[PDB]
Design a binder for this molecule. Structure first.
Ligand SMILES: [Zn+2]
Length: 7
């Protein structure tokens, strides 16, 4: 799957 980090 795909991953997104929004710091
Ligand atoms: Zn993956």
């Amino acid at each position: 799957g795909s991953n997104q980090n929004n710091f």
